[PDB]
Design a protein around this ligand. Structure first.
Ligand SMILES: [Mg+2]
Ligand SMILES: [Zn+2]
Ligand SMILES: [Zn+2]
Ligand SMILES: [Zn+2]
Lengths: 569, 89, 99, 83, 211, 89, 138, 551
DNA sequence: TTCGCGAAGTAACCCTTCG
DNA sequence: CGAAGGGTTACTTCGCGAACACAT
């Protein structure tokens, strides 16, 4: 009973990139999608059960507990779901790199068109220890140029042309009758022999619609990417010892659906119900097309209508990512998914990972005050009531954080919250007993006191050109509600007391508070880094008062001198 | 140091950076992630751009080392094996 | 939340984290970007590293080698966006100790 | 990979300002977690000011481990790093 | 009673930096190997001493000395054949269920003939001894059972799934004021120490025919 | 699930020929997990078969047999019935 | 967790008590059991150590098992253990039966038959009485 | 979560899924972790082998490959660089691991090949000889005969050695077919340009006419050397009969049994092509020419890496040139082999009943047309594929599948309007069985359009065949079903291993004499019932997989 | 409704060899 | 010596960015 458990606080090293195989999409398969999915807002006062959103893929509200993570919007992580679709479809991101596999191999035997000596001559340069990414691009371009000029195959008896796009929609229209044109091929002979039989039945396209070779649709190249190799697909650039490095996982066969943590609900304008995400509307749209393309095998409707439905499928799922297509004037392209919420100026790498909104802050208009020390900012007595520092109690705090916890959240040398030793929750001092609660006060409580004089606190100016726009210097509790500081430290901020307001962040842990003042404070950063000149120094009323004491004729008595030396210090 | 006079912009940055998420935040954030999983890039995280995305300590400035607390172990407590089973009983 | 009259919470831009790197203070970037804003514990698996729930791998369904650690929520919600399209960001784990 | 013996050392015997602010932080974090002080305090709070007095009196029981680009762990002691 | 060489890393809080170094490591190792058993190594008792203790280093978020030690521990694990004294307290419809005096109460022995009779409690007696044709002595309670031990395997158990571990909340709903709540406690887990043998001396101070 | 069909499978080991091939597959799979068959691994390995491995291990190809590898494990039926030493298996 | 060896040198029963009597100061007994409500002493105002409820409960419950036979834990010394170990190695014995003899002391002949397997087919009749004279004397 | 349907590895590999499995089936994971590893990135030396398989050091990757060396499963390339040491660069062998899947049927119808002479002792003695031959990779005669301990039985075994050598089943295994054939040509080509570096005004005609053709006539002779080279056998004072040399190794020759299996496939075809009496004399007139000049199956030894410029017409012409007059024995005559005593009404058998095979080539295909015996095995293989391929797709997808798949072969680039005039489907059964077949190959459509973005639908999608894709795809699907059946066998033998270690060690004759209690004894006849069915499916699936990989 | 270089895509033309 | 194949350089098209953050 109660066996030994021991856990090591491990790091996070490396980030191995791969693609999800169809077996891995159906591994994270808590739900099964693409049966009806027009059910997510159903008749019985709108719950959901096996639709586009489920109570097995999380919670989109405060009530309605999830059936896998028994929690809510602040407890559930998220759950994926596979969406099986017939007649597979090109990946819109793996569409330029699909050619680089498919142009460098044959089209009948599907083997790589490359001599056996050049294989070792390329692997000796590619598997060298110490190959840069630029060197890898150079070698993978060097093998790419060689496999575009060999007009025939190696061990199949087949000719190969150039492979390009259709016109710029998401089709691969290539040719093979390009390199040899006079003693062309026996394939040319069987091509013109199986063309004379056609024109005795439909002479409409005898000369205009003749020069068009073939398509290379995803229904065929999925059965051709499976053929390719097992040992010579590393020359194409893909590692072949992890079981997801096969080139047929780059085509949509199974489709993962995102959780409801990705797709939230919608606020006011409550004339409809809780409105769906654009991802919800786009995900419930391809279910109808995937069921329409599947039921039409044993039903009837002809090859042109089924081709139009499959084209609508391949154009609707390729607009689910990056929305790089027209809509056959609704809005600003009317569709955002997975790249438009990741493109810069509103995305994740730009607007949620690098630059993010942070609590324990505040901004107010700046005003001048020369009577501060130069390492002292002066915050008002109401910002300090709502800016709070965790000061845990240990044997020097205990006699001070006990007279302070009876003082109250309203009186300024006081505290707002109090975290206990067992960390059940955070007790409010506004509603608590605050006399019996103030007496015990164990030595691990994380009672959070107001901001007082002597606290390390950052101070930022938003157009931060160089490193001296964010500085940290000590606090001071003052009257009327505006930030105020000296005027010698006013030139790196490029402040002019015009009405320009600046924001102010506080540290919360000891490890960052003890370095915010030590190598980032004002008194250490008196210079600039770019020149070595002192950047915080004289201002306008600093040298014009210093000049009028020294113009060879300011002669002072005893009584004026003692008053000057008294007002100075 | 790379070898050629190259730029700083979105094609001049990709000369040295094997870090993907650093390249997937500079420009063309879509195309750098689809190309890295195609080529099966390893991306050992050591740069300070990819270090605050995953939320851990950098390797520059303060985090360029670590501090170690002393133990004050004498050579008479632990270095002689205080074993009462000197003979197999 | 964003702006005024909902609640506060002010923003540290990309051109501001450039300044604090020049000081060299590395422990202030853990607070002002991860601890204060968005810190969320998560269950990751050791081999074939993905993120689970409540100590469950959900793909290598054994719940044996799951070692939890804290991560920014914008990094977790990035990964559920990357797995949603096609790509699999797999995270490997090493010890901070044993030198 | 292993540590250099103390007979020869390559780096400077000085105290860079990046290990003066880290040792001021990881000592003040230990005072907040109730470590015994080694200096006569004048009834002061704020463990940033206690660890500053520890650095001023040179009575701090820590050891700074420098890292080489190949890695040889170069153990330097704080009581002999001049500042 | 064997002696292992289990190695483990130890974190000490910054509270206890005033005590001795090897006294704070021994205090922390006793919070993990006192009653907690190692999987398929045996049952630990205490820590013997410490060995090869080096510099304790820190992480940037805790401020604790994560010191790295290796040590030997007095762990109770008998080898393939060992005579050991037990005590009977409960006898079900299955075989004899014994234990050491306050050590581990799951050392149950099934039928394992050279006993020839297995009852539950016919005349307030555990089993019947059909001797031929003298000294028909049996055993009921708290008597000097001197069984042998075998089979060495002790463990195959570690499941953990959220759809079944949160199904225990339904067992807590079944833990209501209904008295006969024999749904969840009758199906417990077999621990990492499951031990059995052959026979016990027939019965206390006697011949003990072929082990 | 999904019900396609294969023409061949049912009603075909009742005859003696397919049963003969199947039982011979069982016999080949049972014998092949024995390595060298009591006379082998000695003659033709030096004779132009991987000179860099038949020169570095000239007496060390005799590791696989059924005369000693099936011999050493059959001595232990008698060393345990007469003597007992406490060593892990 | 990395286990180096599952056994280093498996140990006897008597020096477990000798390791426990130096550990009894860590887990104090009825000689200082009256200090649960007494005055200030030991420079702590209570004279008490920390609890360890998962270790204080077992460090009393192990030695209750080690006193089962010789009640009415052995009363020998270290030099007596050395003398009974020196004279025991003169016979060709296996290590397992050495540990089973030094664990519990056989008083009669048939417990020596239960510890020493196939004693009639391996040993002589003069050795058994000498072993009983050495063991059952103390 | 319903992992019963083998969805766990649908995008895994088709080639790794069989080879690593067959290596694991006889030794285990430490041998399957190299042939399954050398099939995933190509050729590799020993130094760059250790750090990727995640295992033991060079002391284990060398030992387990010796077990693959004396089993003939890998190929090595002994060559040096201009500045480096002597490297190894091991390969993987296709037929050298087909032998492990193939050995049981090898011995079991080499029995039927050797059925001719007598009845009782020959079957058991061949089942003792060849079973020990294939279980090793290379053995001699004097090493086998050191465990007989007899005087006349040893004489019978020594007779059967040369009786198996005269058939074409035992040849001397040399290095020249133990070397990779894709680089054995290049070794016969780089010293051949080194042979003539003459300073003389010779154009690129030297690189196509002199060196290429002389390497052809020096390569085709040297690949035919292991056919018959160990023929002296004139040791008189030991035995009074032809005795095989003791210090001469022997292998299986790997290629005549290929020919016997494909001839069995031809006879199984001829049982349906011609009547019941013509196929018997066709068998007795076909099963005698397999032992003289072997080149019937093989995609040719040289055509693997030089058919890139124009040479395919020369390959077909040389194939049909040496394809005749080399087996040129009596084309239609009498022989003292076997006449099958039956009505094989015709109660007279000379020159009148043995002329019925002359009326076997003028009807539907057996294809021995021109003069007497010319071209019997060249123009069958593009249709022997097409005869078996239609009988699988018609027996699987329905009788209306061969009605649509054979129409498009007649006229490629066919419309749906003119296929309605050729077929008889009602209104929509043209396209319904097309959509039921379009997920499989041999449907492959080509599009016409001259529009911008498919405006007025342009009368597009006329159907072709592209028959070179679907044969390879059928071969992939059959090979995957093969290896999946073997993994069903492997999971069956892995499920219950606690009742197998005792059932074969000491339980031989008393298995029915109450050694197992009657609660699980039916599992012993359940682990032997459908494990018999796995090998029966394997036996009846080898007879269909090996038709799609002809020359 | 705009400049910046880097991807493909396609044509004019020169070197090299064949019979 | 005239003609055919391989290959270098030159003319033309697309897309990705365009600064921080507050109140609407
Ligand atoms: Mg202004
Ligand atoms: Zn949930
Ligand atoms: Zn090809
Ligand atoms: Zn996992």
């Amino acid at each position: 009973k109660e066996v030994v458990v021991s856990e090591t606080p491990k790091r996070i090293k490396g980030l191995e990139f791969s693609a999800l195989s169809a077996a891995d999409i159906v591994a994270q398969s808590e739900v099964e999608v693409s049966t009806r999915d027009l059910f997510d807002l159903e008749k019985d006062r709108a719950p959901k059960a096996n639709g586009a959103l489920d109570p097995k893929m999380g919670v989109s509200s405060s009530s309605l507990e999830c059936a896998t993570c028994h929690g809510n919007l602040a407890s559930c992580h998220g759950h994926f779901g596979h969406l099986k679709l017939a007649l597979p479809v090109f990946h819109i991101g793996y569409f330029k790199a699909t050619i680089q596999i498919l142009q460098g191999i044959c089209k009948n035997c599907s083997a790589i068109l490359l001599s056996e000596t050049d294989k070792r001559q390329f692997l000796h340069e590619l598997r060298r220890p110490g190959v840069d990414n630029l060197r890898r691009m150079g070698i993978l371009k060097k093998i790419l140029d060689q496999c575009k000029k060999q007009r025939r195959c190696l061990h199949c008896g087949a000719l190969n042309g150039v492979v390009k796009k259709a016109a710029a929609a998401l089709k691969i229209i290539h040719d093979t009758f390009r390199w040899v044109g006079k003693k062309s091929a026996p394939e040319k002979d069987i091509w013109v022999g199986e063309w004379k039989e056609v024109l005795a039945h439909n002479p409409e396209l005898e000369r205009y619609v003749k020069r068009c070779m073939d398509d290379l649709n995803p229904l065929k190249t999925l059965n051709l990417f499976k053929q390719i190799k097992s040992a010579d697909c590393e020359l194409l650039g893909i590692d072949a010892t992890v079981p997801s490095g096969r080139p047929e996982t780059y085509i949509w066969r199974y489709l993962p659906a995102p959780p409801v943590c990705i797709r939230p609900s919608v606020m006011m304008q409550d004339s409809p119900a809780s409105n769906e995400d654009d991802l919800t509307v786009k995900l419930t749209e391809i279910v109808w097309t995937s069921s329409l393309i599947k039921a039409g095998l044993d039903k009837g409707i002809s090859i042109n209508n089924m081709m139009e439905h499959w084209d609508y499928l391949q154009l609707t799922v390729a607009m689910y990512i990056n929305s790089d297509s027209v809509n056959p004037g609704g809005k600003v392209k009317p569709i955002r998914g997975f790249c438009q919420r990741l493109k810069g100026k509103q995305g994740r790498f730009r607007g949620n990972l690098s630059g993010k909104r942070v609590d324990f802050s505040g901004r107010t208009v700046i005003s001048p005050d020369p009577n501060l020390s130069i390492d002292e900012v002066a915050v008002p007595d109401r910002v300090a009531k709502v800016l709070t520092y965790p000061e845990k109690v240990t044997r020097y705090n205990r006699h001070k954080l006990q007279e302070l916890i009876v003082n109250g959240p309203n009186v300024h040398p006081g505290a707002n919250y109090l975290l206990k030793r067992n960390e059940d929750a955070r007790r409010n001092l506004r509603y608590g007993d605050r006399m019996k609660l103030a007496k015990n006060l164990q030595i691990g409580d994380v009672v959070e006191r107001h901001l007082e004089d002597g606290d390390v606190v950052l101070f930022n100016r938003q157009p931060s050109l160089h490193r001296l726009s964010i500085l940290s210097h000590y606090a001071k509790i003052r009257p009327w509600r505006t930030f105020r500081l000296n005027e010698c430290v006013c030139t790196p901020y490029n402040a002019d007391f015009d009405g320009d307001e600046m924001n102010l962040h506080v540290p919360q842990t000891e490890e960052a508070r003890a370095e915010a003042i030590n190598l980032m404070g004002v008194k250490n950063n008196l210079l600039t880094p770019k020149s070595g000149e002192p950047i915080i120094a004289a201002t306008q009323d600093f040298i014009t008062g210093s000049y009028l004491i020294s113009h060879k004729d300011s002669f002072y008595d005893r009584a004026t001198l003692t008053q000057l030396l008294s007002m100075m210090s | 140091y790379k070898g050629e006079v190259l730029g700083i912009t979105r094609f001049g940055l990709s000369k040295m950076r094997d870090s993907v998420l650093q390249l997937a935040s500079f420009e063309k954030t879509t195309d750098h992630l689809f190309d890295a999983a195609f080529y099966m890039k390893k991306d050992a995280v050591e740069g300070v751009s990819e270090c605050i995305i995953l939320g851990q300590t950098m390797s520059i400035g303060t985090g360029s080392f670590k501090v170690v607390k002393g133990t004050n172990i004498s050579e008479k407590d632990l270095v002689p094996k205080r074993c009462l089973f000197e003979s197999l009983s | 939340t964003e702006g005024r009259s909902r609640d506060g919470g002010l923003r540290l831009g990309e051109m501001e984290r450039d300044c604090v790197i020049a000081y060299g203070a590395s422990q202030l970037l853990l607070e002002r970007l991860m601890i204060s804003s968005d810190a969320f514990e998560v269950d990751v698996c050791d081999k074939c590293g993905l993120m689970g729930y409540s100590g469950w791998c959900t793909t290598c369904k054994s719940a044996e080698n799951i070692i939890k650690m804290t991560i920014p929520y914008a990094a977790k919600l990035l990964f559920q966006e990357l797995l949603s399209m096609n790509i699999a960001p797999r995270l490997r784990l090493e010890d901070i100790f044993q030198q | 990979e292993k540590a250099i013996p103390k007979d020869q050392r390559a780096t400077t015997p000085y105290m860079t300002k990046y290990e003066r602010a880290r040792i001021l932080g990881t000592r003040a974090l230990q005072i907040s977690m109730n470590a015994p002080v080694f200096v006569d305090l004048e009834g002061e709070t704020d463990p940033l000011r206690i660890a500053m007095k520890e650095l001023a009196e040179k009575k701090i029981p820590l050891v700074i481990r420098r890292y080489l680009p190949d890695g040889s762990f170069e153990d330097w002691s704080v009581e002999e790093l001049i500042v | 009673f064997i002696l292992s060489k289990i190695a483990d890393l130890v974190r000490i809080p910054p509270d206890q930096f005033h005590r001795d170094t090897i006294s704070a490591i021994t205090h922390q190792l006793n919070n993990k190997f006192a009653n907690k058993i190692i999987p398929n190594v045996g049952l630990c008792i205490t820590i013997y001493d410490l060995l090869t203790v080096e510099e304790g280093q820190l992480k940037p978020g805790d401020g604790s000395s994560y010191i790295n030690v290796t040590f030997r521990a007095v762990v109770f694990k008998p080898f393939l054949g060992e005579i050991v004294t037990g005590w009977i307290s409960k006898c079900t419809a299955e075989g004899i269920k014994v234990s050491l005096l306050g050590i581990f109460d799951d050392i149950f022995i099934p039928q394992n003939m050279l006993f020839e009779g297995c009852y539950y409690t016919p005349e307030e007696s555990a089993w019947i001894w059909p001797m031929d044709e003298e000294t028909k002595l049996y055993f009921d309670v708290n008597e000097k059972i001197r069984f042998r031990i075998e089979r060495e395997v002790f463990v195959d158990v570690k499941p953990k799934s959220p759809k079944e571990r949160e199904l225990e909340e339904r067992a807590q709903l079944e833990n209501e004021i209904e008295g006969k709540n024999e749904e969840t406690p009758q199906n417990e887990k077999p621990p990492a120490y499951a031990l059995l043998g052959s026979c016990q001396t027939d019965g206390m101070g006697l011949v003990s025919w072929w082990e | 699930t999904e019900f396609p069909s294969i023409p061949l499978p049912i009603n075909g080991p009742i005859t003696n020929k397919e049963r003969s091939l199947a039982v011979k597959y069982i016999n080949f799979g049972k014998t092949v997990k024995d390595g060298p068959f009591y006379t082998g691994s000695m003659s033709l390995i030096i004779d132009q078969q991987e000179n860099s491995k038949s020169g570095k291990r000239k007496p060390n190809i005799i590791l696989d047999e059924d005369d000693t590898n099936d011999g050493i494990e059959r001595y232990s039926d008698k060393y345990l019935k007469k003597r007992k030493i406490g060593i892990s298996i | 967790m990395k286990v180096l060896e599952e056994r280093n040198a498996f140990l006897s029963d008597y020096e477990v008590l000798k390791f426990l009597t130096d550990l009894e100061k860590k887990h104090l007994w009825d000689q200082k059991s009256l200090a649960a409500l007494k005055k200030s002493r030991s420079k702590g105002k209570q004279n008490r150590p920390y609890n360890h409820p998962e270790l204080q409960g077992i460090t009393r419950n192990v030695v209750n098992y080690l006193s089962i036979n010789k009640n009415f834990i052995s009363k020998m010394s270290d030099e007596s253990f050395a003398e009974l170990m020196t004279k025991l190695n003169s016979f060709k014995l296996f290590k397992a039966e050495k540990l089973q003899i030094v664990n519990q002391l056989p008083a009669n002949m048939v417990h020596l038959y239960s510890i020493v397997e196939e004693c009639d087919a391996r040993f002589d009749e003069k050795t058994i009485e000498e072993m009983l004279e050495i063991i059952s004397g103390y | 979560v319903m992992t019963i349907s083998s969805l766990e590895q649908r995008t895994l590999n088709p080639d790794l899924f069989l080879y690593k499995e067959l290596v694991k089936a006889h030794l285990g994971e430490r041998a399957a972790s190299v042939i399954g590893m050398l099939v995933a990135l190509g050729r590799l030396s020993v130094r760059e082998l250790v750090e990727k398989i995640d295992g033991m050091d060079v002391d284990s990757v060398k030992t387990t490959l010796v077990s693959l060396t004396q089993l003939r499963c890998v190929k090595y390339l002994q060559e040096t660089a201009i500045s480096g040491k002597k490297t190894t660069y091991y390969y993987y062998n296709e037929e050298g691991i087909h032998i492990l899947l193939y050995s049981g049927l090898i011995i079991d119808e080499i029995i039927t090949q050797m059925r001719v002479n007598d009845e009782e002792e020959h079957k058991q003695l061949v089942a003792e000889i060849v079973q020990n031959v294939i279980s090793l990779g290379s053995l001699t005669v004097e090493d086998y005969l050191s465990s007989v301990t007899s005087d006349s039985m040893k004489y019978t075994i020594s007779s059967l050695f040369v009786q198996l050598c005269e058939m074409g089943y035992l040849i001397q295994i040399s290095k020249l077919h133990y070397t990779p054939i894709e680089d054995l040509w290049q070794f016969l080509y780089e010293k051949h340009y080194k042979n003539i570096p003459r300073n003389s005004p010779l154009s690129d005609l030297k690189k196509r006419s002199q060196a290429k053709m002389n390497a052809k006539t020096d390569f085709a002779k040297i690949i035919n050397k292991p056919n018959e080279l160990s023929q002296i056998l004139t040791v008189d004072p030991k035995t009074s009969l032809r005795i095989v040399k003791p210090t001469v190794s022997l292998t299986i020759n790997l290629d005549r049994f290929m020919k016997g299996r494909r001839s069995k496939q031809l006879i199984n075809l001829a049982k349906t092509r011609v009547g019941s009496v013509t196929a018997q004399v066709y068998k007795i007139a076909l099963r005698l020419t397999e032992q003289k000049s072997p080149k019937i199956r093989d995609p040719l030894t040289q055509t693997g890496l030089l058919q890139d410029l124009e040479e395919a017409k020369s390959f077909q012409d040389e194939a049909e040139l040496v394809e005749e007059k080399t087996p040129g024995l009596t084309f239609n005559a009498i022989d003292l082999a076997r006449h099958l005593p039956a009505e094989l009404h015709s109660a007279s058998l000379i020159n009148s009943h043995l002329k019925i095979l002359a009326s076997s080539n003028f009807p539907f295909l057996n294809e021995t047309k021109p003069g007497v015996y010319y071209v019997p095995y060249s123009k069958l293989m593009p249709v022997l594929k097409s005869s078996v391929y239609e009988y699988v797709i018609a027996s699987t997808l329905g009788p209306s599948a061969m009605r649509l798949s054979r129409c498009i072969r007649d006229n490629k680039l066919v419309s749906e309007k003119i296929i309605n005039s050729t077929a008889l489907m009602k209104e929509k059964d043209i396209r319904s069985t097309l959509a039921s077949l379009i997920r499989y190959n041999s449907v492959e459509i080509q599009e016409v359009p001259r529009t911008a973005d498919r405006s007025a639908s342009r009368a597009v999608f006329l159907f072709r065949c592209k028959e070179t894709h679907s044969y390879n795809f059928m071969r992939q699907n059959l090979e995957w079903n093969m290896a999946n059946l073997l993994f069903k066998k492997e999971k069956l033998k892995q499920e219950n291993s606690t009742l197998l270690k005792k059932a074969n060690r000491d339980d031989v004759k008393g298995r029915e004499n109450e050694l197992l209690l009657p609660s699980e004894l039916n599992q012993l006849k359940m682990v032997n019932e459908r494990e018999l069915n796995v090998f029966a499916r394997l036996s009846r699936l080898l007879s269909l997989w090996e038709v799609f990989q002809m020359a």
